[PDB]
């Protein structure tokens, strides 16, 4: 059998017995085949419905208990066996099971002892009976329980980012049934940025919260903080969903969505205007975004007809998410909490944003069609259909009840997107996976991302360039090194994926679905330098981490035995020139121009050998994979020699060698050379323009301002005429016009 055999039988008996009572009385016999088709989140709901009409069947109740046993939900599985046993006492084997499970999970309660006594009298002195007697004894005493707790706390003092240890603390709290303390630590720990990124931790967070909601302790205590803990569950769901989608398989991700949707429906009714309501707002967006990402995962593997329909469906999901407004940040109790919520908001807009674009670039105003056709409520049922099995109640599912009102159907603006990315760099702890994705999403766009601003958001007060550039010791790491690194990681990643699909779209993959986009070498380095900088390394591993970084430094700086293809160096050079050429301050201009000249000075020897059609000495285990896809050709050499000579002149100008800089700039009639010629002629004029000074000099001073005006005009004249020149502008066109207005009013 398969999925089709069992879900097609739905229409078989649906067409034979359509009334609700008989439809649910077939649930046990529906669930009979899903247990065989390896569907346990589905089989669970099928049998559970038959139990809603046939609540006195010991077979059905046991079957659910045996299914909750596969789910490892001890509290739920035990209760099911209990019902089957109290209905039918002859089920001896279940009395053993109950006694077996009660002693394995927790012995503190005498209930485990009672069921063990009965299990003994049903199986006199059987081999299992003693086994359970030893198990019940195994559990430690009061002094023993306290002993374990002190270890975890003393262990958590120095290792607060350890996933396993924090999990054990929640389990120890849960073993003493002080769940309030379990959630209390669980809440104070959702502020940890590392734990929030742990798949297994968030899974524990979902359980420990649910356990507390149903727990007797939650009701007795008060209903005031009930809302507070409820927020974390939604937050946990969002994080857990992001992680499950990437690592887990198609089935597990879909199942988590249902838990997400159940929580949303249960939360919307309360509403209000506090942190919980604001949290519901932002998490609502995440739901669709991840749901869209989830949709695209299924279609990737599937055929073309389903792909377009699913991508159409996903496009709507991402759209819904992007539309959702920035959550009300002021409304949260604390600075940490509110800053977190905004961070996630930026993540939502950024991820959904690029997806909305990459899906809309396929066709012309493709977005408009998506809304005009599927914004209809018919789409809401087509979405629930593709995502879930229709058998689940469509009433308590948030997806089916949401009011899809006035979809903006407006593609995102790049400027807004940039500030979303920059604000969300800390969303996923700056995993090189995160950044390499963003960097690639901008690789297809005409505007480039503010990478230098990304790094400033991550490694604060890390100098742009280190004074002690002589050595490769990793205490001298600089934001330039990182910027130069990410450039290669993305330039490398793009080429690798390009080669993959050629053997078999690459931009369209969502962030969770795609696999590692960088080499484990690169990832190890980034994780190392990150742990080092943020001061979350290990005293013992310091020397190792330190050396791991040191190894690659000599390559990021194009020193001895750099594993750098000439094309990657050139890309670094120009990408830094133009990156620096647009900066306002001199410190930054100098640095970025310096590095650009440096890399240039390393390439030109290679280009000369390549200029005569010779062979480049290939590398030994390079850090950045070589590719013949972008191997430099003679057709492009003279351009680089020219483009490099500009970079030389620019640095000469910044250092003071105006005479040599101008002599070079004037040699080549390029759009960029105009903006440089103009910018330096303006400075010689403005300073001398108004001070008391020799009149003849004043006329010469004015003469330069006259040259400035002319060169800016040549820029705009040639710019408006041809589009290719607009892209060559070292700064935006409006910026050129902005100066010109001031230049002439002077």
């Amino acid at each position: 059998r398969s999925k089709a055999d069992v879900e097609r039988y739905i229409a078989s008996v649906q067409g034979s017995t359509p009334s609700p009572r008989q439809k649910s009385m077939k649930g046990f016999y529906f669930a009979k085949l899903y247990y065989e088709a390896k569907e346990y989140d589905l089989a669970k709901k099928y049998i559970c419905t038959y139990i809603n009409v046939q609540e006195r069947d010991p077979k059905a109740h046991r079957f659910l208990g045996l299914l909750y046993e596969l789910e490892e939900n001890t509290d739920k599985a035990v209760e099911c066996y209990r019902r089957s046993v109290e209905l039918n006492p002859t089920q001896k084997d279940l009395v053993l099971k109950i006694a077996e499970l009660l002693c394995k999970n927790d012995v503190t309660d005498g209930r485990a002892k009672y069921w063990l006594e009965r299990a003994a009298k049903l199986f006199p002195g059987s081999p299992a009976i003693y086994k359970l007697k030893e198990q019940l004894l195994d559990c430690e005493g009061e002094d023993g329980w306290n002993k374990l707790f002190d270890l975890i706390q003393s262990e958590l003092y120095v290792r607060p980012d350890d996933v396993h240890v924090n999990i054990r603390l929640v389990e120890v709290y849960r073993s003493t049934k002080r769940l309030k303390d379990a959630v209390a630590h669980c809440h104070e720990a959702e502020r940890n940025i590392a734990l929030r990124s742990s798949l297994e931790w968030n899974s524990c967070v979902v359980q420990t919260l649910k356990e507390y909601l149903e727990s007797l302790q939650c009701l007795e205590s008060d209903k005031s903080d009930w809302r507070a803990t409820n927020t974390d569950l939604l937050l946990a769901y969002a994080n857990l969903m992001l992680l499950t989608l990437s690592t887990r398989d198609v089935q597990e991700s879909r199942e988590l969505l249902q838990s997400f949707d159940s929580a949303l429906q249960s939360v919307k009714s309360l509403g209000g205007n506090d942190e919980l309501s604001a949290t519901f707002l932002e998490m609502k967006g995440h739901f669709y975004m991840h749901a869209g990402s989830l949709l695209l995962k299924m279609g990737q593997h599937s055929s073309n007809v389903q792909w377009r329909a699913l991508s159409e469906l996903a496009a709507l999901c991402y759209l819904i998410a992007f539309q959702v407004p920035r959550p009300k940040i002021k409304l949260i109790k604390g600075e940490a909490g509110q800053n977190l919520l905004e961070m996630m908001a930026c993540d939502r807009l950024s991820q959904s944003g690029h997806m909305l674009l990459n899906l809309s670039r396929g066709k012309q105003d493709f977005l408009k069609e998506i809304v005009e056709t599927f914004a209809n409520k018919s789409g809401q049922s087509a979405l629930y259909d593709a995502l879930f099995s229709s058998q689940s109640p469509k009433d308590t599912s948030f997806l089916g009840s949401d009011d899809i009102g006035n979809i903006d159907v407006r593609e995102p603006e790049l400027e807004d997107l940039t500030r979303y990315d920059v604000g969300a760099i800390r969303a996923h702890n700056g995993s090189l996976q995160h950044l390499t994705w963003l960097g690639l999403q901008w690789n297809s766009l005409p505007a480039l991302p503010g990478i230098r601003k990304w790094l400033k958001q991550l490694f604060h007060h890390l100098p742009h360039e280190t004074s002690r550039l002589e050595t490769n010791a990793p205490e001298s790491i600089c934001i330039l090194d990182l910027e130069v690194f990410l450039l290669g990681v993305v330039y490398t990643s793009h080429l690798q994926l390009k080669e993959k699909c050629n053997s078999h779209q690459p931009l369209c993959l969502p962030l969770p679905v795609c696999k590692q986009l960088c080499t484990e070498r690169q990832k190890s380095w980034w994780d190392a330098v990150c742990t080092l900088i943020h001061r979350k390394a290990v005293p013992g591993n310091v020397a190792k981490l330190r050396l791991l970084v040191q190894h690659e430094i000599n390559t990021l700086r194009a020193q001895e035995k750099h594993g750098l293809q000439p094309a990657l160096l050139v890309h670094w050079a120009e990408c830094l020139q133009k990156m620096g050429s647009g900066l306002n301050s001199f410190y930054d201009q100098r640095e970025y121009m310096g590095r650009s000249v440096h890399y240039w000075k390393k390439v030109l020897p290679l280009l000369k050998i390549i200029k005569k059609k010779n062979s480049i000495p290939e590398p030994i285990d390079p850090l950045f994979k070589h590719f013949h896809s972008v191997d430099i050709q003679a057709s492009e050499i003279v351009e680089y020699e020219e483009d490099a000579h500009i970079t030389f002149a620019i640095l000469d100008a910044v250092n003071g060698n105006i005479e040599d800089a101008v002599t070079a700039f004037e040699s080549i009639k390029s759009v960029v050379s105009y903006w440089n010629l103009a910018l330096i002629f303006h400075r010689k004029a403005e300073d001398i323009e108004n001070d008391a000074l020799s009149p003849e000099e004043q006329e010469e001073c004015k003469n330069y301002l006259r040259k400035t005006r002319d060169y800016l005009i040549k820029i705009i004249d040639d710019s408006d005429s041809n589009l290719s020149v607009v892209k060559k502008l070292p700064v935006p066109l409006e910026s050129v016009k902005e100066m010109l207005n001031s230049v002439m009013q002077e």
Partner: antibody, heavy 129, light 108 residues
Framework: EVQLVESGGGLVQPGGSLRLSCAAS????????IHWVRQAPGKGLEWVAS????????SYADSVKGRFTISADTSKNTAYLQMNSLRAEDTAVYYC??????????????????????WGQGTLVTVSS | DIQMTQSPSSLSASVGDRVTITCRAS??????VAWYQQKPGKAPKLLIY???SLYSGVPSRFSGSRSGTDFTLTISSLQPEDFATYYC?????????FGQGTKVEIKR
């Protein structure tokens, strides 16, 4: 261009709390170990806290163990000395200082710092009811 | 616990003298000792690190030395600006301890 500035001092009542701030600039705060050293009037130097360079494992003198808490923030490029249950005996001038990773070695049974190169101006803390 | 016993507690000398201060480590300690100069009210400054290595910028008349568990600061020719209090410091496992200090008073 490189300096350490202490702040967050002033007077407080016994059994109260304070928080000192050691703002650093000019050296990569990640690779530096941070220490606090108090000195009562007319008395000598007493080491009270340390933070290993690249990770930040704490270590306090028994005279203040469990009461004080020293921390380091990469984003703010600043270290702090949280002080609780302050006693009249804690009245002293509190200095902070760094020890680069070049001088921070880890050994079986604990770590050692070769010396304290950069020192701060020193912020006064008075504890008297 | 390790203890650095500094001697003498208070010293009196005049300019040009070859002055000596000594600190004894109770337990056998490795060469991870330092020396500091603290002028009245000002901050302590580092003179010698790793027992006998001179901190960059310190005058050449300062020199550190060790013998067994006794560490010794040595000034070849005392100067007027060197009349201040000095301290010795050991760095053992996850612990730092200072000597009681030595005041260098001008003799008359």
């Amino acid at each position: 261009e490189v300096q350490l500035v202490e702040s967050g001092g002033g007077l407080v009542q016994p059994g109260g709390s304070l928080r000192l701030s050691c703002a650093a600039s000019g050296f990569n705060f990640s690779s530096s170990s941070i220490h606090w050293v108090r000195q009562a009037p007319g008395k000598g130097l007493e080491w009270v806290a340390s933070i290993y360079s690249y990770s930040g494992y704490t270590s306090y003198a028994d005279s203040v163990k469990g009461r004080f808490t020293i921390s380091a923030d990469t984003s703010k490029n600043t270290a702090y000395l949280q002080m609780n249950s302050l006693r009249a005996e804690d009245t002293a001038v509190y200095y902070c200082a760094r020890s680069p990773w070049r001088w921070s070695g880890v050994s079986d049974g604990g770590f050692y710092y070769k010396a304290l190169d950069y020192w701060g101006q020193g912020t006064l803390v008075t504890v008297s009811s | 616990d390790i203890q650095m016993t500094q001697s003498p507690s208070s010293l009196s000398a005049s300019v040009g003298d070859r002055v000596t201060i000594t600190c004894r480590a109770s337990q056998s300690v490795s060469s991870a000792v330092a020396w500091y100069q603290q002028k009245p009210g000002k901050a302590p400054k580092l003179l010698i690190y790793s027992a006998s290595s001179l901190y960059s910028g310190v005058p050449s008349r300062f020199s550190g030395s060790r013998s067994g568990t006794d560490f010794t600061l040595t000034i070849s020719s005392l100067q007027p600006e060197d009349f201040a209090t000095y301290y010795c410091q050991q760095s053992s496992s996850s612990l730092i301890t200072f000597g009681q200090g030595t005041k260098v008073e001008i003799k008359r």
